[PDB]
Design a protein around this ligand. Structure first.
Ligand SMILES: O=C(O)CCNC(=O)c1cc(-c2ccc(F)cc2F)cc(I)c1O
Ligand SMILES: O=C(O)CCNC(=O)c1cc(-c2ccc(F)cc2F)cc(I)c1O
Lengths: 115, 115, 115, 115
C-alpha cells in the first residue's frame, strides 16, 4: 500500500479507532475530487485506500474526522477535522504514511515517506 | 483581537517570520469565502485579522502557507500548507489564539481560547 | 529575562496554570543542582527565573510537574513530569523560551531562542 | 515485548535510524539504575529492551540521544536528549510503546499503552 493513515489518541494513550478518513485529489478544474475513504481499525491504522496504479502524481488532501471521534467520547473539541494537504509522487512513486496524534484542542501530524 | 495566529519554526528555534496566512469563512453553499489574511511579524504573530463585530459564530479555516516558507529556507517540505478548521462559538471562548509549530515534514497546531 | 517557560493545556485549550517548574544546572560531579523554580501564572508563563548574570553557559534541566497538574483535573496521566535538557550558549541566542504543550499521554516541547 | 521505542525524523520525514536509547529504573535508594539500552533500527524502532519478567513495576526513564543523532547530520540541536519518565506496570503488566518525533529545536513524545 502506497498510502496509509495512522491516528493516535493523546488523552487515552491508545490508537484512535473507528476514525473516518476521506481523501481527495485536486482535479484539472482546480476542485477537490473524492479519491478514497475508510475508517481506522483497532490498531488506529487505515490501509487499502489505494493502489500504486491509481495513486498517480497529484495534490492530495487527507481529511481526518476528529470532531466525530471526540464527540462520541463526550468531548467537545476545537477542530472540525485535521487536514493534511501534500503533493505526492512528483519524483516517482513513494510510500506515504500520514500520522495524526489527537488531543481535544490540538493535533500533531507527520509523514514518513519511503522509496 | 478576537483572533490571533502564531507560527513557530522547529528547525531554527525561532518565530516563523513573513509567513502568509489566509482565513476563510464557510458560506451557505459550503464554499470557503475569503475572510482575512496577512503575513506573520518578526515575532511570528499576526494580529488585527478581524474585529469582535465581524467575527461571528461560524466555521472558519486558517491556511498557513508553510510550503513557501520552507522553500525560501531551502528545505524540501511535505505539506502544501497547514490548515486549521474550527467552529467559533460565543458560549465563553472570547479570544482565540491559533498556534502552529512547523517542521518540514510535520506540524503541531493548538488553540488557546481564553475569557 | 534570559529564560522564560510557558506551559499550555491541549485538553482544555488553555494556559496550564499553577504548574510547578524546577530548573537545575549540571554540576562538576554530574549531579543536578537546584537552580530556579516557580509556578506558572494565569497566562501559563513563568518569568523571572534567573538573571543574565546568573545564567551562564552550562547544561540546564527544566522539569515541568505535569503529573500533579493532570491529577488535579482528574485525568490519568502517563508521565511523571516533562523534562527539557539543553546547553545554554552565549554565541547568539540571548533569550530562551521553553514551551510545553501538554496532553495526558503526550507532550510537545519547543525552544524559541531570539536575539 | 512489553517495551518498544520508536523514533521519527520530522525534517526528513523518515524513521530516525541508529539513535541511541538508554533506559533506567528508579531504585530503592532513589537513584537511576541502568535497566536496558539499544539503538533504533532502519525502521526507527527498538525492540527487545526487556522481558515481561524483568519489566516489573517501577518508575522508568527512557533517554533518547537526540543530540548525537542531529550532530551526525550536521545540525546543532537545542536539546541534549529527549527524556520520557513514567510509572510502569502499577496496575499489572502492560505493553508500552514510547514514540518521539524529532526536530532540531523541538520534539513531541507520546505513549501507546495496551493490555
Ligand atoms: O499565549 C498563549 O497562551 C497562546 C499563544 N501561544 C501559543 O499558543 C504557543 C504555542 C506553542 C506551541 C505550539 C505547538 C506545540 F507542539 C508546542 C508549543 F509549545 C509555543 C509557544 I512560545 C506559544 O506561545
Ligand atoms: O511507523 C512508521 O514509521 C510510520 C507510521 N507511524 C507514525 O508515523 C507514528 C507517529 C507517531 C507520532 C505522531 C505525531 C507526534 F507528535 C508524535 C508521534 F510520536 C507515533 C507513532 I506509535 C507512530 O507510529
Amino acid at each position: 500500500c502506497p498510502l496509509m493513515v495512522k491516528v493516535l489518541d493523546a488523552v487515552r494513550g491508545s490508537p484512535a479507532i473507528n476514525v473516518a478518513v476521506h481523501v481527495f485529489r485536486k482535479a484539472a478544474d482546480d476542485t477537490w475530487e473524492p479519491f478514497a475513504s475508510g475508517k481506522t481499525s483497532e490498531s488506529g491504522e487505515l490501509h487499502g485506500l489505494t493502489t500504486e496504479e491509481e495513486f498517480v502524481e497529484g495534490i492530495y488532501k487527507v481529511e481526518i474526522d476528529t470532531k466525530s471521534y471526540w464527540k462520541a467520547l463526550g468531548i467537545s473539541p476545537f477542530h472540525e477535522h485535521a487536514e493534511v494537504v501534500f503533493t505526492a509522487n512528483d519524483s516517482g512513486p513513494r510510500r506515504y504514511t500520514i500520522a495524526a496524534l489527537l488531543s481535544p484542542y490540538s493535533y500533531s501530524t507527520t509523514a514518513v515517506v519511503t522509496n
